[PDB]
C-alpha cells in the first residue's frame, strides 16, 4: 500500500507563539499535539523517520536529526516546552536545512516536510520563489498547517510542490488536521532483526528497547512482529456466501467448504484475517 516517508516537522518559535486562543501558551499546545502525532505516525508507518526543526530569530536549528526513533523525538519535545521564543521565524532557512539532508534520500520514498506555522512574517535573507522551483525538482512535498490567517506564500508553497494548506478553527480542528498526515500516500533496504531481548546482530552493540538503527554500524534494527501487522492486505481473504453445527465455534467458505455461523463470519473477516479451515 503506502511507501516509506521521511517527514520533517517544522515548528514555529516566533514571538506570536505566546498568544492565546488555544491552551494558554500557543507553543505548548503545538508541542502537546505533536507528541501525539509522533506516536500515531510510527504505528501506521513501521520503517519511517521523523525530523523536527525549529525556527527562531531569522535562523533555523535542527532539534533532532532524521532518525526513526519513536522515543528520542518525544523526550526532546518535552525538553523544549520552556523555549524563550524571541524574534520572527524564517521559511527560506528552514526549507534549506530540510533540503540539504532530504535531497540524499533514495528515490523510492516519499520525502515530505510539514510546516506548522503560527507567525505571519517570514523574514529571510533570500528569495523564496527559487526554493519552490528547487523543491519541485527534488520531488519534496511541502504541506503547511497555518494558524490564525492565510499567508500568500504558504499557498504557493503548498500547491506548487504538491502539499496542502489548512488553517485552524480551534484545538479540535488542529488535532483533526494532524491525523490526515499520519496516513501514507499510495527498493530493498537492509534491516537486521533483534533476537535476544534487544541486541544488535551486525556488531553486538547492546542498547535499550528501541526500533532505532544501530549507532555504530549504521544498520536499521526493526522488530519483525511490527512488520507482521501490516500483512493480510496483500493476498487478503475473500468474503463468503450464506444460504446449526459450525467449524470455528462448534455450536460458508467456498475455498475449503467449511460451514461457519453468523458470529464466526463477523470474526474471521474482521479480526482473525485468516480462515480457520484453510490453515489445515
Amino acid at each position: 500500500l503506502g511507501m516509506m516517508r521521511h517527514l520533517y516537522v517544522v515548528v514555529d518559535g516566533s514571538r506570536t507563539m505566546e498568544d492565546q486562543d488555544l491552551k494558554p501558551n500557543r507553543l505548548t499546545c503545538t508541542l502537546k499535539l505533536l507528541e501525539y502525532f509522533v506516536e500515531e505516525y510510527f504505528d501506521q508507518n513501521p520503517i519511517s523517520q521523523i525530523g523536527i526543526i525549529v525556527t527562531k530569530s531569522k535562523r533555523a536549528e535542527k532539534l533532532t536529526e532524521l532518525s526513526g526513533n519513536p522515543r528520542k523525538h518525544i523526550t526532546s519535545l518535552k525538553k523544549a516546552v520552556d523555549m524563550t521564543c524571541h524574534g520572527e521565524p524564517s521559511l527560506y532557512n528552514s526549507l534549506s536545512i530540510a533540503m540539504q539532508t532530504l535531497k540524499h534520500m533514495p528515490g523510492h520514498t516519499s520525502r515530505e516536510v510539514l510546516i506548522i506555522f503560527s507567525s505571519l512574517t517570514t523574514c529571510d535573507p533570500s528569495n523564496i520563489y527559487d526554493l519552490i522551483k528547487t523543491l519541485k525538482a527534488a520531488k519534496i512535498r511541502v504541506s503547511v498547517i497555518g494558524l490564525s490567517a492565510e499567508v500568500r506564500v504558504c499557498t504557493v508553497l503548498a500547491r506548487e510542490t504538491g502539499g496542502t494548506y489548512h488553517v485552524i478553527l480551534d484545538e479540535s480542528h488542529y488535532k483533526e488536521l494532524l491525523t490526515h498526515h499520519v496516513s501514507p500516500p499510495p527498493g530493498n533496504t537492509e534491516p537486521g532483526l533483534t533476537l535476544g531481548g534487544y541486541f544488535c546482530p551486525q556488531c553486538r552493540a547492546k542498547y535499550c528497547e528501541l526500533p532505532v538503527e544501530c549507532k555504530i554500524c549504521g544498520l536499521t534494527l526493526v522488530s519483525a512482529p511490527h512488520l507482521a501487522r501490516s500483512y493480510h492486505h496483500l493476498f487478503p481473504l475473500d468474503a463468503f456466501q450464506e444460504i446449526r453445527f459450525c467449524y470455528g465455534c462448534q455450536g460458508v467458505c467456498a475455498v475449503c467448504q467449511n460451514v461457519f455461523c453468523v458470529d464466526c463470519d463477523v470474526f474471521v473477516h474482521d479480526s482473525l484475517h485468516c480462515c480457520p479451515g484453510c490453515i489445515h
Partner: protein
C-alpha cells in the same frame, strides 16, 4: 444561455448570473423604454460591465429604431481598453450561438498621444506637445504647398487617409486602441482620424468623459453623431468635479507674464488684426491691475465686466469672440507650434468665459496666500459653482443617460446638484456565499480616549499613540498587506515622525515593511512595486498613503494586496478655502443643500471609493476598518453605500482598539477556509 428579461432575449455570455445582477438588467430596461435617465448603483467593476453590455447590445436588436448607438464614457484609458475587451467576449459568444457575421463595429477613442504611428512625433512625453508637432505637420497651410507634391514636411498617414479612407468603412471586429494602430499600420492610414471619422457609424463607442462633458470639445466630436443614443457614465461618483474643472480657468502671475511674451512675439510678426493686439494689450493690463492689489479677498462675477469697461473701456460684445479670433489669427499667421501660445489661449478662454457664463460663477482674487501673511504670489480663480452647466447639453441632446458607479452615496443628492429627474434612481447590493467584508468603526482608544482627526485633536499625544497602537496591533493579525489612507500629506508626515520619536514605529517594522506614497511619480511607482512583491513572498507590507491621492483612485487592490484598508480619519477637503466657502453659498441658496451635509457627502464618497477598492471578485475577502469616532454618527455612516452598510452591525460600531483586533482575527480565520 437564453436569459429572459421581461421583454427581451438577452444572450448572456456566462453560466451563473447573480440574483442581484439579473435585477440590474430589469431596472436598466426600465430606463430605456421610458426614454429617461437613471441613477443606478452596483458595486463591482467587472460583472457590472458585462451585464450592462449584454442588455443594451441585445436591446438594439429588438428595437433597432429606438436606440442605435451606445456611448460608454469611462474614466481613463486603462478602463477604456477593459470595456472593449469585455465587448468582443460577448461578440464572439454571439459568433458561436448563431454561426454568422454581423454589421457591428465598436471603437475606442483617446488622445493623439495614444493613436500615433509617425516616428518623429510619437516619443514626445507631454500631451500638449504631441498636438503641436502634429499641427506643424498637418495644418491646412502645411498641406497648402503639398498640392504641388514636393519634399516639404508632411504626414504621410494623414495625406493617405483622406484619399481612400472615406469610401469604405470599417467592416466588423471590435477595436482596441492597439488594434486601431495595427489596422492603421498595415493599411497605411492614420489611427486617430480613422477613429474620429468612423465614430459616426458605430454601435458601441468607448471614450473618456472629456469628449462629452467639456463644452469646447463635445462640439467637435459628438455634435452630429446621434439624437437617439444611450450614454453610460461609468464610475461617475465624482461626476460633479469633472463638470466644475472643465468650465473653470485659473490665472496667476506666472501665466500672465508669459502672455506678455506671446503678445511681444505677435507684435514682431504683423510687421512682416492690429486692433486685436491692442485689445489684448488692454485686457492684459487690467487683469494684472486686479492682481496688483494687496487687500481682502473679494468676489464679483458680473461686476468684473463693469470694471473692465471703466478703466479700460472694453464692452462685453467683442469679448465673446475673443477666443474665436485668436484661433483665427494664429491660422492666418501660420504659427508652427501651438504649445508655446498656451498661456494666451488660457487668457482668451478666460475672456470668453466671464462674458457669457455668469449666473452661478465667481471670481476670487486672493492676494493673502495660504497660511502666510506676506508671500508675493497672488492668484485669481474663475471658479464654477453650479455643476449642472456642463451636463445640460448632455441631458438634453441624447435619449437616455445612465449615471452608474459603485459608491453613489445618497442617491438623491445627484439629481439635486445636477438638474434632472431620473425615472428609477435605484440601488443594489451584491450577494455572496460568505460575508466577504467585515466593516468596523474603531472608535475610542485602548484607554477610553477618543481617536478623532479633528483640527484641535491632532497635536495631543493621546491620539497619535492610539493611532500607532492601532496600526501595530493590526499588523500582527492581518496577513500580507495593509493600506492605511491618511487624510493629508502634512498629517501623514507629522504622525510617522511622531511615531519614530516614540517607540511605536520600531514595533511595526518588525512585523511588516512600511512603504510611503509620496507626491512625485518616480518614488511612488518604485514604492508600489516593492509593495506588491512584499505581499507575494512572506514578508508582508504596509502602504500608508493619502486619501485624495494617486493610489486611492488608480490602483485596484485585488485579493492578498491589502486585506485590510485602514481609514485614519474622515477624508475632508480643506473646509476653509475661499473657493469651497463660496460654492457652499451657491449650494445653500440654490437646491437648499445644507453646508454641513455636503462636506460629509463629499468625504463619504472618497472614504467609500478607496475602501471599496479592496473587493474585486467572488473569492476576494477584505477587512475595512474606519478608525475615526466621527464615522459612528448617523449622518456619516448612513451615507456610505448599501453594500458596505448592510454588514456594519451595531456591535462593530464603537469598538475599542483591542476589541477591534478580535473581530479582525476572527474574521480572517473564518475566511481562510474552503467553501
Amino acid at each position: 444561455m437564453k436569459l429572459n428579461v421581461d421583454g427581451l432575449l438577452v444572450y448572456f455570455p456566462y453560466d451563473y448570473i447573480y440574483p442581484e445582477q439579473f435585477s440590474y438588467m430589469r431596472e436598466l430596461k426600465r430606463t430605456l423604454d421610458a426614454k429617461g435617465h437613471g441613477v443606478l448603483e452596483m458595486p463591482s467593476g467587472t460583472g457590472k460591465t458585462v451585464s450592462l453590455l449584454a442588455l443594451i447590445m441585445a436591446y438594439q436588436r429588438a428595437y433597432p429604431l429606438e436606440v442605435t448607438k451606445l456611448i460608454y464614457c469611462s474614466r481613463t484609458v486603462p478602463e477604456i481598453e477593459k470595456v472593449i475587451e469585455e465587448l468582443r467576449k460577448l461578440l464572439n459568444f454571439y459568433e458561436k450561438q448563431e454561426g454568422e457575421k454581423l454589421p457591428f463595429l465598436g471603437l475606442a477613442l483617446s488622445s493623439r498621444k495614444n493613436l500615433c504611428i509617425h516616428p518623429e512625433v510619437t516619443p514626445l512625453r507631454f500631451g500638449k506637445d504631441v498636438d503641436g508637432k502634429c499641427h506643424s505637420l498637418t495644418a491646412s497651410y502645411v498641406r497648402a504647398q503639398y498640392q504641388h507634391d514636393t519634399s516639404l514636411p508632411h504626414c504621410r498617414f494623414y495625406e493617405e487617409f483622406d484619399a481612400h479612407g472615406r469610401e469604405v468603412p470599417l467592416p466588423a471586429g471590435i477595436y482596441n486602441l492597439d488594434d486601431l494602430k495595427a489596422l492603421g499600420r498595415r493599411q497605411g492610414w492614420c489611427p486617430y482620424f480613422l477613429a474620429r471619422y468612423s465614430i459616426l457609424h458605430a454601435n458601441v463607442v468607448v471614450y473618456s468623459y472629456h469628449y462629452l462633458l467639456d463644452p469646447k470639445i463635445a462640439d467637435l466630436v459628438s455634435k452630429e453623431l446621434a439624437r437617439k443614443a444611450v450614454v453610460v457614465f461609468d464610475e461617475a461618483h465624482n461626476i460633479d468635479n469633472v463638470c466644475i474643472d472643465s468650465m473653470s480657468v485659473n490665472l496667476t502671475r506666472r501665466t500672465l507674464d508669459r502672455c506678455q511674451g506671446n503678445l511681444e512675439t505677435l507684435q514682431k510678426t504683423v510687421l512682416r488684426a492690429e486692433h486685436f493686439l491692442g485689445f489684448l494689450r488692454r485686457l492684459l493690463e487690467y487683469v494684472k491691475w486686479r492682481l496688483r492689489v494687496q487687500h481682502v479677498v473679494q468676489e464679483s462675477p458680473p461686476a468684473f465686466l463693469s470694471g473692465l469697461a471703466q478703466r479700460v473701456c472694453i464692452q462685453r460684445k467683442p469679448l465673446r469672440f475673443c477666443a474665436e479670433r485668436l484661433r483665427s489669427l494664429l491660422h492666418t499667421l501660420e504659427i508652427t507650434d501651438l504649445a508655446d501660445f498656451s498661456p494666451l489661449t488660457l487668457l482668451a478662454n478666460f475672456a470668453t468665459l466671464v462674458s457669457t457664463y455668469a449666473k452661478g460663477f465667481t471670481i476670487i482674487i486672493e492676494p493673502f496666500d495660504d497660511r502666510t501673511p506676506t508671500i508675493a504670489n497672488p492668484i485669481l480663480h474663475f471658479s464654477c459653482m453650479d455643476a449642472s452647466l456642463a451636463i445640460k447639453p448632455v441631458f438634453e441632446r441624447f435619449q437616455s443617460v445612465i449615471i452608474t458607479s459603485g459608491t453613489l452615496s445618497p442617491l438623491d443628492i445627484y439629481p439635486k446638484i445636477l438638474d434632472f429627474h431620473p425615472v428609477t434612481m435605484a440601488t443594489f447590493t451584491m450577494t455572496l456565499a460568505r460575508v466577504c467584508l467585515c466593516p468596523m468603526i474603531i472608535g475610542r482608544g485602548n484607554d477610553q480616549v477618543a481617536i478623532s482627526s479633528k483640527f484641535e485633536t491632532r497635536e495631543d499625544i493621546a491620539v497619535i499613540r492610539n493611532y500607532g497602537n492601532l496600526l501595530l496591533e493590526m499588523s500582527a493579525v492581518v496577513p500580507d498587506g495593509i493600506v492605511a489612507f491618511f487624510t493629508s500629506y502634512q498629517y501623514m508626515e507629522s504622525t510617522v515622525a511622531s511615531w519614530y520619536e516614540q517607540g511605536i514605529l520600531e514595533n511595526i517594522q518588525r512585523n511588516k515593511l512600511l512603504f510611503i506614497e509620496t507626491q512625485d511619480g518616480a518614488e511612488t511607482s518604485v514604492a508600489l512595486e516593492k509593495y506588491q512583491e512584499a505581499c507575494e513572498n512572506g514578508r508582508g507590507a504596509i502602504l500608508l498613503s493619502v486619501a485624495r491621492g494617486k493610489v486611492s483612485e488608480g490602483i485596484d487592490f485585488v485579493h492578498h494586496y491589502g486585506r485590510a484598508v485602514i481609514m485614519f480619519g474622515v477624508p475632508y477637503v480643506y473646509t476653509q478655502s475661499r473657493i469651497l466657502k463660496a460654492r457652499l453659498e451657491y449650494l445653500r441658496d440654490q437646491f437648499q443643500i445644507r453646508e454641513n451635509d455636503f462636506l460629509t457627502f463629499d468625504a463619504m464618497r472618497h472614504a467609500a471609493q478607496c475602501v471599496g477598492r479592496a473587493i474585486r471578485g467572488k473569492t476576494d475577502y477584505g477587512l475595512m476598518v474606519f478608525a475615526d469616532k466621527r464615522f459612528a454618527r448617523g449622518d456619516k455612516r448612513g451615507k456610505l453605500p448599501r453594500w458596505i452598510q448592510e454588514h456594519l452591525t451595531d456591535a462593530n460600531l464603537n469598538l475599542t482598539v483591542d476589541e477591534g483586533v478580535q473581530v479582525a482575527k476572527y474574521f480572517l480565520r473564518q475566511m481562510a477556509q474552503p467553501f
